[PDB]
Amino acid sequence: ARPCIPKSFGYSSVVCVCNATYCDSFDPPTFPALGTFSRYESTRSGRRMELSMGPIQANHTGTGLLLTLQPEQKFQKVKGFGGAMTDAAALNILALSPPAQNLLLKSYFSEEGIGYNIIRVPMASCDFSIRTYTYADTPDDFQLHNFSLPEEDTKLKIPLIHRALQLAQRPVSLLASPWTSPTWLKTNGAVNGKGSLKGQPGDIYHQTWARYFVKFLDAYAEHKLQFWAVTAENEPSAGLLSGYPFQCLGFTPEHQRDFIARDLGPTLANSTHHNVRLLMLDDQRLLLPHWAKVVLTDPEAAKYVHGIAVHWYLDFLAPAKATLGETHRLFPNTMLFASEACVGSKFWEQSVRLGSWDRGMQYSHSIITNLLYHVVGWTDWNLALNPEGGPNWVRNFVDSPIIVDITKDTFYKQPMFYHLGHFSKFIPEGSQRVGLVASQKNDLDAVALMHPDGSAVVVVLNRSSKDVPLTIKDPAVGFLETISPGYSIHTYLWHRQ
Numbered sequence: 001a002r003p004c005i006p007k008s009f010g011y012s013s014v015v016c017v018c019n020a021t022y023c024d025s026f027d028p029p030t031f032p033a034l035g036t037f038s039r040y041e042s043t044r045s046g047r048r049m050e051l052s053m054g055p056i057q058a059n060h061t062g063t064g065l066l067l068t069l070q071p072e073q074k075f076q077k078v079k080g081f082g083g084a085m086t087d088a089a090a091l092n093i094l095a096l097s098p099p100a101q102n103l104l105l106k107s108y109f110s111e112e113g114i115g116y117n118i119i120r121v122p123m124a125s126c127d128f129s130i131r132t133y134t135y136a137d138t139p140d141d142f143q144l145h146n147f148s149l150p151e152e153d154t155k156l157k158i159p160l161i162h163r164a165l166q167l168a169q170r171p172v173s174l175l176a177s178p179w180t181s182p183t184w185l186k187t188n189g190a191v192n193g194k195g196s197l198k199g200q201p202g203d204i205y206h207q208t209w210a211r212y213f214v215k216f217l218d219a220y221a222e223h224k225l226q227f228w229a230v231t232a233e234n235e236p237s238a239g240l241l242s243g244y245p246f247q248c249l250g251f252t253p254e255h256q257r258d259f260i261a262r263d264l265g266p267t268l269a270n271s272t273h274h275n276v277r278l279l280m281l282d283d284q285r286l287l288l289p290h291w292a293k294v295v296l297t298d299p300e301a302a303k304y305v306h307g308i309a310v311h312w313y314l315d316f317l318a319p320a321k322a323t324l325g326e327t328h329r330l331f332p333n334t335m336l337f338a339s340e341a342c343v344g345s346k347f348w349e350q351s352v353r354l355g356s357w358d359r360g361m362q363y364s365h366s367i368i369t370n371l372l373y374h375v376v377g378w379t380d381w382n383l384a385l386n387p388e389g390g391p392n393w394v395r396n397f398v399d400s401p402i403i404v405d406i407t408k409d410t411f412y413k414q415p416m417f418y419h420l421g422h423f424s425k426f427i428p429e430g431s432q433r434v435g436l437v438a439s440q441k442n443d444l445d446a447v448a449l450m451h452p453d454g455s456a457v458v459v460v461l462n463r464s465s466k467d468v469p470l471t472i473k474d475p476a477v478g479f480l481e482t483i484s485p486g487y488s489i490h491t492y493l494w495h496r497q
């Protein structure tokens with residue numbers, strides 16, 4: 001194990017420096033006997049996922065807040081955690097020396113890292129690319145004979161994905177999402193701007209688009225990479241806003257409904273990739289529960305939809321109860337998955353804030369809220385960016401857990417990285433969220449889950465400045481006496497047998 005090498009850039013906290021020959025890492029996991037718990041702590045004051053151990057006694061010496069585990073109250077099962085392998089992220093990673101590259105990849109997917117098991121893959125270009133393009137830019141090739149993968153996939157994205165799964169501690173699932181389709185298939189013949197597919201669901205246009213997903217999946221299959229799921233379109237509501245800058249393809253909720261039912265679903269279901277999951281929406285949760293009602297209430301469409309994917313930033317504000325909550329109630333069997341979660345856009349804030357503890361807290365808090373509202377998985381945006389928040393052919397407006405400084409063969413791990421880690425590293429796929437009852441009103445954000453092996457995992461986030469005394473109870477083991485320091489994030493682990 002190697003500790004974090006702190007560096008400050010004038011913000012609330014520090015970043016962990018990593019170069020070609022050094023990067024903070026964890027030792028293989030070793031779970032303690034019954035009556036003992038493990039604590040991983042990170043604090044704005046510097047500490048980064050530091051490990052410590054303590055006892056779980058049958059005696060309760062705490063007189064403050066009490067969180068009781070209710071393993072019997074069971075909810076959703078976790079799919080996993082990850083990030084997007086965009087053109088930008090791959091260019092930044094591939095800009096470091098090979099040795100540095102592996103330390104970065106291990107940071108994310110290795111047991112020595114935080115164990116990512118999900119990777120979102122853009123289908124062709126998006127705003128985080130250094131050039132506009134699709135897999136079939138040659139006009140009027142409805143049978144997609146010239147469909148092919150550019151250097152971005154074959155030289156950048158794909159090789160990095162392979163290297164990721166190799167280092168991968170756990171099985172990694174791949175999620176694919178399109179931004180725009182060839183311009184000749186669109187009403188406005190542009191990669192961006194207000195424009196949807198031409199004609200209506202069912203014609204040669206929509207059929208050509210549907211085929212495109214299959215062509216993508218084949219091309220990747222040819223490269224020994226199979227996907228777990230695909231989104232019907234990235235942020236489809238954006239393609240309805242006149243003059244949208246990023247590559248898009250607008251779909252009204254009705255249009256997505258007819259498209260899934262008429263073209264995408266049938267075409268996918270009739271291909272050798274029929275086992276690939278189809279996720280709808282993949283947009284801001286403010287569009288729920290409406291978008292859900294329009295699509296899922298149509299059997300011809302619903303039968304093809306495995307789950308609803310949501311985005312929603314952090315700098316802004318949204319009500320989870322009215323959005324994720326209501327949607328689960330109306331459709332309890334359609335999983336909710338977070339396909340994109342970024343932050344750092346406030347018009348007054350710098351795009352990339354090296355060491356910002358606030359942005360980290362926004363991730364852990366947002367992940368906790370999602371978990372409390374049935375979400376089964378999390379997919380961060382760009383896996384890595386430069387200090388300017390790029391490259392982005394349109395404009396930099398978001399941060400990233402890892403920032404690469406190309407000119408010094410070094411990369412920085414932001415508070416964001418560890419906050420994500422507090423979850424992704426200790427919540428393997430298959431884990432199931434369970435009850436965690438607070439004895440009284442408090443200022444902490446907590447969530448409990450049960451590993452597939454039965455052990456317990458509890459994350460406690462303290463966004464306040466004051467230290468909060470806390471007692472955690474597992475009816476089967478006893479009481480865990482601890483303290484949640486102001487501006488900290490904890491993750492407890494313990495055997496229940």
Ligand SMILES: *[C@H]1O[C@H](CO)[C@@H](O)[C@H](O)[C@H]1NC(C)=O
Pocket residue numbers: 005018019020021022
């Ligand atoms: C960065 O890695 C360690 C950590 O600070 C440092 O000692 C080393 O000199 C740096 N790498 C190089 C070769 O500059």
